[PDB]
Symmetry: D2
Subunit: 208 residues, 4 copies
């Protein structure tokens, strides 16, 4: 069994992206007999697609769990659906602001995550990790990768399971925000990392 | 040197109050040559006052740091001011809902915290702990104890420093909220506990 | 040209639903040569579907604009997508709480609104009406009707345009909330009504 | 009987301040036999104090109701207390950012508003206007003027009643915010204006 976990590089002026650290921390670890691969994706349309496709083709993971930062969210959120659309509120790390455009022309308007989202949420709660199901992953890079991953699965037969998980800011990211007159919610890095590991474990169990 | 740290018992239907655990965890520990005393207060007007006064008279702390739970707040908050008023939105653990009434008739309308709040906030940020200064501790039990403590200091000469710190919900407290259709912010118990220890350390340093 | 505008009856303990008044106020009015039909739907799965289908078949509107109340939202929100799923956080007015179930088995996972959402948002802003595009209409009754309407259009060829618009609470609905210790955002009934009229006008212009 | 109502000029990059319009709209009107004076204050420490003092000395109002804009607040808020401190999160319209400094050295740490706040809130609710009591007017210009007004009353015997009322953004102010990726709450100008008139009426009735 092979598991692919992806994270994103910093974006929107943020100095760090905790999902980048998650991917690096999980890369190379084994959970039982399952091998985990951690890869960092660029927050750039086009390039992110190239890297994602190459990685999927290279590793051919049975399970793909894409992780991203959701500024302002107070708990772990498991995405229920990926939408075939791009409508960026801000430009990507290359200064491109795509608006009202499909991700894959002619493909389904949406794809449901194939991760066992309800079982994952339940296990997270048992571990004392606040989490809920999100019905919109946005229409920026997180949704972009989520959709392409699910499209790959529907078109190529793998990965068997694919989904997206958004995490809150970690505490250290809030420090300089306080001066800007506002304090968004945060969650410890340790908890965010464990949440992803739990998702992997539940997926492995639910897979076959 | 003696430090008094107080917490509160559960209230408002909540199953736990993380500040109760903070007080118990800090009780009896020593920070350098300073002795720390941890005491749990009831969330009941009158009784809370009795316990507080007895404890202050008994221990005669040089520093008093009162801690409480602030449901919904996203980071550690250090209270700048205590107000001479009681206007409860909900009744206390005895079913009493006091409205528009002074805490100490004839006493000052307000007292500024005497803890070195700015230095505490600065040290917390250096430790990677989100925190900000709050200008209202509410007009329920937290403010009640904060005011009585500062009044005691102004009238009896001790404690030399007195203040209040509110902490967010800890993660495990959010679990059953999710079902009630809403996800408030949270902070790890470990971080909330460390934040209080840091406040004690800064107060000890700033004291003399 | 015929325009169908729907609203919902009160639900979730609320005494009123401003969208019910919107539907009644717009029923029978004419905008140019276009005839507007206003109908109130029950907040009940199954029954809502029956009424919706009968109304669509009866009137055969060229444009269908479904309106609903979105407690907590601060501005007019135009829904971008309807999802083929039902996952109610609360039961409907008949005490039924449907969970993880498709609206139309075998039908597309999602449908994009066919109303000219960007042009509507732009006109609303020009009129001084705060509004934004929402990417999730929830998975309760609003999404239920939005999806069924768009499914009808894709399967029957009419209405040519279909979409959903969520409105905030109107001021009078906030009064008794204040006592429950919390103050959600609101928008005047006059503005909410005008927003819907504007949407109808833009749709008529964009249609042919 | 004479009533003084003040508002503020635009600040913080905002193009307008609805309270400036409130003051201008109420200036010169009569409510019964009571004469109302409306004056606009600068959002500048020092200068605001000069204008306020001159106005109070000039008019010698029986009632003083100071109004200000509270970005983000969802309903009318009546301030319960003014604090003897200045700790600005942003500089004033002159580029001055005062931090940790008293408004009037040696004066009381705080003053309670002398407006009949509970009766005002009650009448507002009866009129269908969402409103609540705020326990912190901030430590910027609004609090600055509120404190100086109450200090004037305690030191000079007039005005007999003094207080502060914060109002939400009005709808037109939200338009350009939507693009900045965020939609704060708003309230119609008509309602905000009526709320202030109601406060004046209740104060006049409660006065003698």
């Amino acid at each position: 069994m092979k598991v692919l976990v992806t994270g994103f590089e910093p974006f929107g002026g943020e100095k760090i992206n905790p999902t980048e650290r998650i991917a690096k921390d999980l890369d190379g670890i084994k959970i039982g007999d399952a091998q985990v691969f951690g890869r960092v994706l660029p927050v750039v349309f086009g390039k992110a697609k190239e890297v994602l496709e190459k990685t999927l083709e290279e590793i051919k993971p049975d399970i793909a769990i894409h992780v991203g930062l959701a500024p302002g969210r107070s708990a772990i959120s498991i995405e229920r659906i990926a939408v075939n659309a791009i409508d960026a509120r801000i430009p990507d790390n290359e200064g491109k602001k795509i608006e009202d455009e499909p991700i894959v022309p002619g493909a389904p308007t949406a794809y449901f995550s194939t991760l066992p989202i309800k079982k994952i949420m339940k296990k997270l709660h048992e571990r004392g990790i606040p989490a809920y199901i999100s019905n919109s992953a946005g229409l920026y890079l997180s949704n972009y990768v989520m959709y392409l991953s699910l499209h790959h699965s529907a078109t190529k037969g793998y990965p068997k399971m694919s989904g997206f998980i958004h995490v809150p800011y970690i505490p250290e990211q809030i420090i300089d925000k306080i001066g800007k007159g506002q304090v968004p919610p945060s969650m410890s890095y340790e908890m965010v990392l464990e949440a992803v590991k739990v998702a992997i474990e539940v997926a492995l169990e639910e897979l076959l």
